């Protein structure tokens, strides 16, 4: 990829870049999944052994406060601001908020809201005054890459994201193990109840939670499952990684071309009865200038 910005890249020290990041040592892990219920079109399989070079990854998704500092320093204008609208979940649109008639096919719970963007996540009249440490949302893949570059970082590859999110467990279902609520404790912010009609908020949240909510995984990462989808560097495909080659098994970068970029981790909207996509092997995609109220990102860096 070859982006273009209108801000210069500031000088930063290695110690500044690494703050809030964890160092993932070089090694191998088993990537992918073989859940019999996985949707074939998602390409969760095959399970494969992947070798990665050492890397750093953020413990937390990028927060509103952090994104605000980036915008302050650079004047960056997000894709949602250029387009003038972004996607908001229907239950979060205040009555009377002007909305577009647009329909996401198959997903009528998404509303295109003029003026929804990172600082007004439910549209005109909303703000982030009470959400400084929540993940920034309504950021597109372009916005994420812009922030990461300004920060001296990059987006993780899908393999880096998954190795870090798995937190040192071999082929577990979730970042922490195989049970969704071990000991009856919620471990992530997803949907409870009847999707898309009623979210009971059993886990504490019916929208985003602070980036440090719930316990971390074994490597110290928070909210890799649930909360917000997280953009990765890779172009999406369902089958590039089915090939067995150095390109797909050693520091894999994904296909060299595509139309949508990978997103990992699930969000506060995911539920077993609909998408079941909060498992750590799960994956989907979105086009790179798209933005939504349930999608953010975390950064990685070469050491």
């Amino acid at each position: 990829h070859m982006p273009s910005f209108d801000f210069d890249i500031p000088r930063r020290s290695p110690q500044e870049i690494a703050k809030g990041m964890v160092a993932i040592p070089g090694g191998t892990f088993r990537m992918g999944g073989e859940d019999p219920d996985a949707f074939p079109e998602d390409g969760e399989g095959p399970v494969r052994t992947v070798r990665l070079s050492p890397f750093l990854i953020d413990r937390y998704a990028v927060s509103n406060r952090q994104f605000a500092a980036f915008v302050k320093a650079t004047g960056y204008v997000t894709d949602a601001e250029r387009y003038g609208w972004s996607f908001v979940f229907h239950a979060h649109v205040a009555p009377g908020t002007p909305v577009m008639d647009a329909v996401v096919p198959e997903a009528p719970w998404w509303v295109a809201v003029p003026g929804a963007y990172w600082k007004a996540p439910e549209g005109p009249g909303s703000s982030i005054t009470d959400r400084p440490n929540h993940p920034v949302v309504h950021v597109s893949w372009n916005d994420a890459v812009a922030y990461a570059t300004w920060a001296g970082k990059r987006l993780p590859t899908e393999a880096e994201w998954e190795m870090a999110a798995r937190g040192g467990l071999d082929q577990a279902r979730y970042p922490w193990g195989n049970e969704l609520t071990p000991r009856g404790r919620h471990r992530c912010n997803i949907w409870q109840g009847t999707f898309p009609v009623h979210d009971t908020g059993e886990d504490g949240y019916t929208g985003t939670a602070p980036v440090n909510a719930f316990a971390p995984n074994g490597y110290g990462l928070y909210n890799v499952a649930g909360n917000v989808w997280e953009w990765c560097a890779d172009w999406w495909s369902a089958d590039w990684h089915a090939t067995e080659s150095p390109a797909t098994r050693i520091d894999p970068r994904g296909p060299e071309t595509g139309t949508a970029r990978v997103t990992k981790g699930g969000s506060f909207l995911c539920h077993e009865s609909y998408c079941n996509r909060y498992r750590v092997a799960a994956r989907t995609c979105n086009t790179p200038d798209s933005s939504a109220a349930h999608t953010g990102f975390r950064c990685a860096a070469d050491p």
């Binding site: 949707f39 647009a102 198959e106 998404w110 909207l269 086009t287």
Partner: peptide, 16 residues
Amino acid sequence: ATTPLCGPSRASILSG
């Protein structure tokens, strides 16, 4: 009926 959708794209709403 078709694959569940978690990522809503700007392209998806363009229709005539």
